[PDB]
């Protein structure tokens, strides 16, 4: 059950292209991305 939101998303990680609200939700989670375990290189 997901359905009714108010306001939008300016800050958008390029990353992946996730969203966030705020300035620093973003920031603390571009950092999940730089440096991370998994086999997953290229
Ligand atoms: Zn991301």
Do not use: M, N, V, W
């Not at 359905?3 to 996730?18: F, I, L, Q």
């Amino acid at each position: 059950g997901s359905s009714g939101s108010s306001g939008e998303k300016p800050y958008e990680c390029t990353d992946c292209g996730k969203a966030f609200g705020l300035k620093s939700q973003l920031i603390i989670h571009q950092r999940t991305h730089t440096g991370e375990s998994g086999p997953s290189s290229g």
